[model samples]
Target: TAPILLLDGASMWFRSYFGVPSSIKAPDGRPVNAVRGFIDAISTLVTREKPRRLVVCRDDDWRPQWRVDLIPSYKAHRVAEPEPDGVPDIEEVPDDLTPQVNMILELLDAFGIPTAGAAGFEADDVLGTLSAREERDPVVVVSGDRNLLQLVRDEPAPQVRVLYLGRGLAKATKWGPAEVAEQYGVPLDRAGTAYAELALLRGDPSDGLPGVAGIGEKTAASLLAKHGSLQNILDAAHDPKSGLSKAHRTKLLGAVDYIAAAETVVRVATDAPVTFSTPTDTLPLAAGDPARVAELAAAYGVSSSISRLQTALDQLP
Candidate 1:
């Protein structure tokens, strides 16, 4: 069966910005390392996975104000600066990487890769919605963000998997239900849902989520193993006969508000208006527009990378 590959546009470009040398530049003194590296990374994945459908999901709204309204500190640390517009705080991106990001998007569009996003949703939400809607197509979500491991589902036909690239694309790890279970110590049976539960309890400082006070990964996983979920743990905290430790119960009870909000914040949205058009998303058997692609490639000094991507696409079934 043909597979659907979802690319986390921002995640890959951010990784590329850091991984590739800034010295890799265009003829106009602009650094295109991120651009070149981005293309190469996608090319590598396309070559290896041979996906029949691919969509590059971007963040029309990276921070998404609704998420911040729930958990005020949601991704607060990542904010470079904020405006008075009342939208979610914008993420801090390097100035040098901005133009390159546009170039990458332009090139992706030129190459006929379908790009989809909601006006007020992050790429993660888009990826989540797309994965949840799958009924018969195997889906592979590519991202460096471990949080996305929550999307992996083993049952209900056409399984979902996350190709975790936290370590880098060269060392990407494929995470199915079993892999997520082993790594996160969540129950093997409900690993997909449990990973998000475990993450909520453990807190992700990187994302500014202050999980239950005094609870670490081991404690979080232990609680999930015993109680099954955050809600269950909360119920146990209030259940006198449940035998939850006094200290743990106190912590969980005290953070009831946070627990309520963080669950919604931590879990990606399954109903985001994410739609990939068949005509746009279908993997190109040939270049979308050879002349424009060539012009952009030459202008951006990504000729080799673009060529390699096309070559890889040629092998697609």
Candidate 2:
């Protein structure tokens, strides 16, 4: 009766690659720090939460062309052409971290851990779909992305919570509707949806959204609190008697097209066609392929991390 754990694969792996020291290397002297750190992080999460079901959601397309078509700048800054020197600065996937992703996937397969992704969607979309469609179990989404804060909800049967790792796993915060509302000043009744709306209005430079020219986080939250929703705010922007301030009205009206497009870009897709690596998401009590797991652990010099994962799995209910 434990919650289903949904992990943002790329988010956590990137965190692992940066958080863990590169001194941890494979048998071939390549850095496997991300692989080792990812295993250890999962081990830590499992040992702490004891979830019965788990899925690592992946970004099959971290920057979908559909999103770019809607907003040309959506994550465009992160995209980089190949550099001759192989410097890690501009590329979205670092040179050392790329191979480690394959290692992590192979290790997960050997361990029987299910991983899910949509063909043209990011991991956030996969998490959104999984959490939104769940009717049987409470969902616990683990991620370092602030955007995922909008997924925290408590309605329609099983609840959904987010274990936000924005400050690293050790300092992670568990968020439900109340936490999101209190933290972001969105309506408690519809905190999850309202949070997305707030993000749309405020925009995120990191994701390449150019929000309303004059509005910022506080202004966005205040508008949502006043209007109750983005649609209501949009309607008010066109109504002189809607109590919307003149300056705010002008800003909102000027950004109508951007707002329309950002609604899709800011909100995670709840209807993505998700595919999984394994048939079942149930947490494994033992490695699915113990021999392969051992072989990979030995080859990757990650025996200690794999052992920790095994111990965590063995302790599961």
Candidate 3:
């Protein structure tokens, strides 16, 4: 059987909001950049991949307390509140695009497409659990976040990969073991590990982790490849014969606590504390509410995108 298509709900939609024109809008005069564009992107993936099932993974809690307690900087910037239990207000998303998100949800529900989210988990975690649990099918995880790089290709669990939307859906990169190894210096043997080491060392301004002050992508990648793991790198920092240079070793050792606690947080959670029995079978189509979907399409001027989705699914092999 073909693998499932696991979607990072917010990541893909946020990209759509910016990539597609803000020309789309709902009937009440609200902008639908995020919604219209998101629908089109999902349609493109389903049509192109022809997955046997699909699951839209959502971030019920974008920044959980456990993650915050570890680094105090996990997704701190985009969040409205930095507190542990903070229900960070809906981010300052584009003014008119916010409500459209609900419309997007309505459309999916109307189609019976299943979207799953856990109270204290991010979409990344949901994608992780699904990938880890289902070993029978070849899975494709679509997202715009680099953090998801952790879940690509640990194999025998089905060839899990990511369709990165950071560069827009048009040029969304297909990432697996080979891509991770080539781009990040992660060996094919430890693809995801390299990314966590790189992210931890280089730090992410977006997430608010200060990281090791001067470390960047290249330095972090090199360190990870040589040491094999963050723990090994830390151990080598204090050992002169471990091949890590004095300057490099000092940085690794200095960020000990941060490195220790963050190694797990840096990677998406593979075992999320939730479950879903039914799996994705098909995407939302217009067969049920041609009139309502048509109304949305006409109002938003996205009849083609919506129609394209139905056509794509219909032609799925």
Tens-digit lDDT string for candidate 3 (1-317): 76689999888888877777776665566677787788888788877787768888877777787888898767667765354354643455665666677777767765567788776888889988888787678888999888788777756667888888877878886899788888888667878766767788888777777778667888777777777877787778877877788888777777778778887778778788754423544454444567777776677656777787888778876
Runs off by more than 4 Å, candidate 3? 81-89, 238-241, 275-304
Off by over 4 Å in 1: 85-88, 276-280
* Ten-residue stretch with the least lDDT total in model 3: 277-286
lDDT of 1 by residue, 156-199 (tens): 87899999988999999789999999988999888988999889
lDDT (C-alpha) at residue 150 in model 1: 95
The model with the greatest lDDT is 2
Q: What is residue 95's positional error in candidate 2, in angstroms?
A: 0.6
lDDT (CA) per prediction: 0.88, 0.90, 0.76
- What local lDDT score does residue 239 receive in model 1, on the 0 to 100 scale? 92
By TM-score: ranked, best first: 1, 2, 3
Alpha carbon lDDT of residue 15, candidate 3?
82
TM-score of each prediction = 0.96, 0.95, 0.89
Better of 1 and 3 by lDDT: 1
